[PDB]
């Protein structure tokens, strides 16, 4: 999404007080059922929001990086069993503590619960927009959009080809809100020269659609 600091002073604040660390991708951080107990500031990468159906069935609906608040659905509701709110799409690091650390330094710095709850709250309403949408979205095209839409995101890096997205069929199949089958088979028919390059764990596109 672009135009979000990391070094923000507010974080340096809680910084001071934090582990800052985390892993290379791969390492879902709230989505299994595993006490969330400690908060995550993204102060470098770019994960991917992803929330439970229903069926329980994971489906991404946004993106998050580097300045954007991570724990936030573990700990106010204290669920301490994380359900589904972010999986680390490409290597990032995040500043970690467990929420009673983090209670204190909002009651000595009372900007930092506002940090937090004001940069969440922009989330829940871009994913209360997406559920009336992708509840119908149809695949046609739709994920060609959400493709150029990560061109807009650091995790996306730019070769003298195209735009280097570190992604999976699954991802962009919950986005567009269809499944892993629709979404996978179009982007292998893309990879086999019909539309962009596609490699399974990675997708290469144009910027042309």
């Known amino acids: 999404v672009l135009g979000k600091p990391q070094t923000d002073p507010t974080l340096e604040w809680f910084l001071s007080h934090c582990h800052i660390h ?4 791969k ?30 069935k994971e ?49 000595v ?3 930092i619960l506002m940090r937090l709850s004001a940069q969440m709250a922009r989330r829940l309403q871009v994913l209360i927009e997406k559920v009336g949408n992708l509840a119908f979205l149809d695949v046609t095209g739709r994920i ?8 807009k995101q650091p995790d996306a890096m730019t070769h003298p080809d195209g735009m280097q997205i570190k992604i999976t069929r699954q991802e962009i199949g919950q986005i567009v809100g269809c499944s892993r089958e629709t979404v996978g088979r179009i982007l292998k028919m893309l990879e086999d020269q019909n539309l962009i390059s596609a490699h399974g764990k990675t997708i290469v596109v144009y910027g042309t659609r």
């Open 22 to 25: 985390k892993y290379p991708s």
């Open 27 to 56: 390492s879902t951080l709230i989505h299994q059922g595993e006490k969330a107990e400690t908060l995550y500031y993204i102060v470098k990468g770019s994960v991917a929001v992803l929330i439970k159906d229903e069926e329980g």
């Open 59 to 107: 489906m991404i609906l946004s993106y998050l990086n580097q300045g954007d608040f991570i724990g936030e659905l573990g700990l106010f509701e204290e669920g301490q069993e994380r359900s589904a709110w972010v999986r680390a799409k490409t290597a990032c690091e995040v500043a970690e503590i467990s929420y009673k650390k983090f209670r204190q330094l909002i009651q």
């Open 109 to 111: 710095n009372p900007d």
């Open 144 to 151: 060609a959009q959400t493709l150029l839409n990560l061109a």
